[PDB]
Amino acid sequence: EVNLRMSWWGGNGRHQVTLKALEEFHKQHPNINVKAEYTGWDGHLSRLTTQIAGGTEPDVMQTNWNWLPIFSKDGTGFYNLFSVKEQLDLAQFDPKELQQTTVNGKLNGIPISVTARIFYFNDATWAKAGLEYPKTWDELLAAGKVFKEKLGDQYYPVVLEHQDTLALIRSYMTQKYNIPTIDEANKKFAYSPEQWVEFFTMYKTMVDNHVMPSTKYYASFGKSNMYEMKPWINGEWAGTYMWNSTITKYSDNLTKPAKLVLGPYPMLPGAKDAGLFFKPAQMLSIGKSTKHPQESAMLINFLLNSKEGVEALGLERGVPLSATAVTQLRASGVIKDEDPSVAGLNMALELPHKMTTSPYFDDPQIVSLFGDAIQYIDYGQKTVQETAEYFNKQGDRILKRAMR
Numbered sequence: 001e002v003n004l005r006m007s008w009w010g011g012n013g014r015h016q017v018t019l020k021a022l023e024e025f026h027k028q029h030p031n032i033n034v035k036a037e038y039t040g041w042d043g044h045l046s047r048l049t050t051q052i053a054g055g056t057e058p059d060v061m062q063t064n065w066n067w068l069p070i071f072s073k074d075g076t077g078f079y080n081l082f083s084v085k086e087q088l089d090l091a092q093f094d095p096k097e098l099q100q101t102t103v104n105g106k107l108n109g110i111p112i113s114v115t116a117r118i119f120y121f122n123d124a125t126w127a128k129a130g131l132e133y134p135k136t137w138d139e140l141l142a143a144g145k146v147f148k149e150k151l152g153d154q155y156y157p158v159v160l161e162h163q164d165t166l167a168l169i170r171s172y173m174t175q176k177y178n179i180p181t182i183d184e185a186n187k188k189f190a191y192s193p194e195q196w197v198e199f200f201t202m203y204k205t206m207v208d209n210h211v212m213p214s215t216k217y218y219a220s221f222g223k224s225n226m227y228e229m230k231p232w233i234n235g236e237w238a239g240t241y242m243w244n245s246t247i248t249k250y251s252d253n254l255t256k257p258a259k260l261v262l263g264p265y266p267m268l269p270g271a272k273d274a275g276l277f278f279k280p281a282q283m284l285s286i287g288k289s290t291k292h293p294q295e296s297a298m299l300i301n302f303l304l305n306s307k308e309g310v311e312a313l314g315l316e317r318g319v320p321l322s323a324t325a326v327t328q329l330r331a332s333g334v335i336k337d338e339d340p341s342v343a344g345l346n347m348a349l350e351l352p353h354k355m356t357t358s359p360y361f362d363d364p365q366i367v368s369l370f371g372d373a374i375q376y377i378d379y380g381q382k383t384v385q386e387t388a389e390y391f392n393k394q395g396d397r398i399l400k401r402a403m404r
């Protein structure tokens, strides 16, 4: 007679399918009740951090890979799933994906899917602009002027939120210099002061060349989710550098007949590595002190492995890593090669991508610092030179506290 709580984040489409899956789970186990706790991405980590600090987190959580150092530096912040391998079929998940979710030999999460940020474009707006999708960084930067002149000041090749930008310029810097962004031995960023000048100078170039809204223009709209903004819905902001695993949260709010379409991935001649931010998209974890680890395990197995859970959940989290699950969704015709999300992943996997991203590159205080920094620049409060030093200094401090 078992009462479980489960949290997750995502759009309403993801909420809808998860809710149907939990109703089927309860149908399958009338002795097991699941209270569902769901929101969008915004504030979700923050609410979870409060819960975990008071020992009141859910039995089952959808978790983010970059949270592992936050909650489980020593692998003990989430229940070890090696202890519930009897309810939960672990062999369906590739051992090297499961290694991305293991900390000090403890299995902290089951990776649901993998993802990298790639370029998707509004095919309607790009058609009107008369432009081909950029194949090079130089083309991306040259696209802004064409949009601006051809279609109007309100038209932009892409919109980039600060976290997207952080990833994008890093990918460019990885292509050029082929070094990790974070030096983990020394608990600090690897870039020289000059490469940080180059990083923020690139931002300023793209903003001046009309590639994307400045953070000041972006702020003139409202506090909405980006995919919920008018200039996104009406095609004026004509693309996104986005996780393939959540691309329908974006393309579903376009004005028909507009679609998001996979763009090419810009690669500097002579680059040894595309500098993708490629990671597990999300995990399902069990609370450290859950009073029901076995029922929590059963629920995660249902959702990720069972015919019924897998069918219900569809692709609202990306392309399943579970071998049974992904085979199932291909056989039911739900996974189609031409779908932007599946095509996005295939293209990414073919890109040279040996460099892995440190979970510290996505530390929420580092991401928040980045947005502060480009806002310094856009609102004229710091020069590029000053912003680059500021970011390097304040960032190395955060890293030290984060990697503590």
Ligand SMILES: O=C(O)[C@H]1O[C@H](O[C@@H]2[C@H](O)[C@@H](O)[C@@H](O)O[C@@H]2C(=O)O)[C@H](O)[C@@H](O)[C@H]1O
Residues within 6 Å of the ligand: 009, 010, 041, 064, 115, 163, 243, 245, 246, 249, 280, 281, 282, 317
């Ligand atoms: O919901 C997802 O599928 C993703 O959520 C997380 O990303 C955040 C937002 O949900 C997403 O719209 C994007 O803008 O980036 C945000 C972020 O990266 O923190 C995960 O980080 C993704 O891997 C994915 O699970």
